[PDB]
Amino acid sequence: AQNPNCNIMIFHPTKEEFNDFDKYIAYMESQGAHRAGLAKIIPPKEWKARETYDNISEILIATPLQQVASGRAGVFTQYHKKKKAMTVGEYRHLANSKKYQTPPHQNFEDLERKYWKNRIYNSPIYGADISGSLFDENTKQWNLGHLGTIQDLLEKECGVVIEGVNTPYLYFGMWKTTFAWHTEDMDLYSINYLHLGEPKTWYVVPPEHGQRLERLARELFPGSSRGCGAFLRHKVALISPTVLKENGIPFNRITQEAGEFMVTFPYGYHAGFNHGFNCAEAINFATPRWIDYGKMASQCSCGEARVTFSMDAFVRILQPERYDLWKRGQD
């Protein structure tokens, strides 16, 4: 069995290997990359996402989210308070202000220590989940707006035609902006490209050990667990690496820098934070290996998780028994 310790693998495809996206994902999995839940892909040196980032300041962040924490430094939840619209140029200036900027630090490790010590005492503003793309239309390789759609994969594998679309999303971050512990909708893959700015640190649990994380989360967030049988779908809970290590939960960490891709694999729980002002683009995707994970994915039916239009068909076809109750949650 390849990669039996479930380490995060880093790949360096040649420009020839960068042509066929599906084939490269299948190659990474042949080497055991999926066992980690997360892989890094460094693009060939000849590749570029677009020519420059000089003209992005007028993008609108319609609903910036202030991420307010509750709990203790290593075990907390966050809620998203909606703020007034602002442009990317206004958000960058905010991120660089004395109130919000990255503090002086020695290296990524020192910054990670400061994040876990002090995150809860601040409420950074995240420009998350903005439909759109920063890939130039002429970028032919690994262009996250030109991938094969999940609906087309389901049709090719299972023979059923369904409604729905699959488009990318932009994330504009600042110091301490945080993504809570989660797997993707319907335990899909994700791919994330860091277009510009400061790094993003990731934590991940191997898919084969995901239920260990869920059992810890039920212990640590006991009221939330009573409220919903899949409350990590709410995407609000954080647990630090120190707490994970104290509780014997297998995990790994890695920092993504500008110009690098990350792939998350089906049922790979992940969480993390931004180092300073940045912009990432991400989208969900599927492969034939996903289908069996989709069929078994947990679902929130309490009503909190509320998700896209296109998830309806995935539930309806892959999880017909759950459909009824899940749809109640969304309606």
Ligand X SMILES: O=C(O)CNC(=O)C(=O)O
Residues making up the annotated binding site for Zn(2+) are 228, 234, 300, 302
Q: Which one of Mg ion, Zn ion, Ni ion, none interacts with residue 58, CB within 5 to 8 A by kind?
A: Mg ion
Mark 219-258 with x for binding to Zn ion (rule: CB under 5 A) and - for no binding: ---------x------------------------------
The backbone torsions φ and ψ at residue 51, rounded to the nearest 5 degrees and listed phi first, read -75, -45
Q: Which one of Zn ion, ligand X, Mg ion, none interacts with residue 280, CB within 5 to 8 A by kind?
A: ligand X
Q: Which stretch binds Mg ion (CB under 5 A): 59-67, 76-84, 179-187, 275-283?
A: 59-67
State yes or no: residue 238 binds ligand X (CB under 6 A). no
Q: Choose between 306 and 327: whose C-beta lies nearer to Ni ion.
A: 306
For residue 173, give every residue at least 6 positions away whose Cβ sits within 8 Å of its Cβ, in sequence order, or none.
95, 126, 127, 197, 198, 200, 274, 276, 277, 278, 279, 280
State yes or no: residue 278 binds ligand X (CB under 6 A). no
Q: Choose between 190 and 310: whose C-beta lies nearer to ligand X.
A: 190
State yes or no: residue 58 binds Mg ion (CB under 5 A). yes
Residues that bind Ni ion (CB under 5 A): 190
Give min distance, CB of 60 to Mg ion, in A.
Answer: 9
One residue of 86, 125, 232, 280 binding ligand X per CB under 6 A: 280
Give min distance, CB of 100 to ligand X, in A.
Answer: 17
- Total count of residues recorded for the chain: 331
Torsional sign, CA 92, 98, 100, 101: positive
State yes or no: residue 54 binds Mg ion (CB under 5 A). no
Q: Which one of ligand X, Zn ion, Mg ion, none interacts with residue 264, CB within 5 to 8 A by kind?
A: ligand X
Question: What is 119-158 written as a DSSP string?
Answer: GGG---EEEEEEE---S-TT--SS-TTSSPPHHHHHHHHH
Regarding beta strands 261-264 and 125-131, do their DSSP bridges make them parallel or antiparallel, or are they unpaired? unpaired
Dist CA 277 CA 280 (whole Å):
10
Give min distance, CB of 27 to ligand X, in A.
Answer: 21
DSSP designation for 19 = S
Burial (CB count within 10 angstroms: exposed 0-12, middle 13-18, buried 19+), residue 59: middle
CA 190 to each of CA 166, 169, 270, 291, 312: distance values in angstroms, whole numbers, following the listed order:
12, 11, 11, 14, 19
Q: Which residue numbers belong to the known binding site? A: 126, 182, 184, 192, 200, 228, 234-235, 270, 300, 302
Dist CA 17 CA 168 (whole Å):
23
Q: Which residue numbers belong to the known binding site for Fe cation? A: 182, 184, 270
Residues that bind ligand X (CB under 6 A): 171, 179, 190, 192, 264, 270, 280, 282
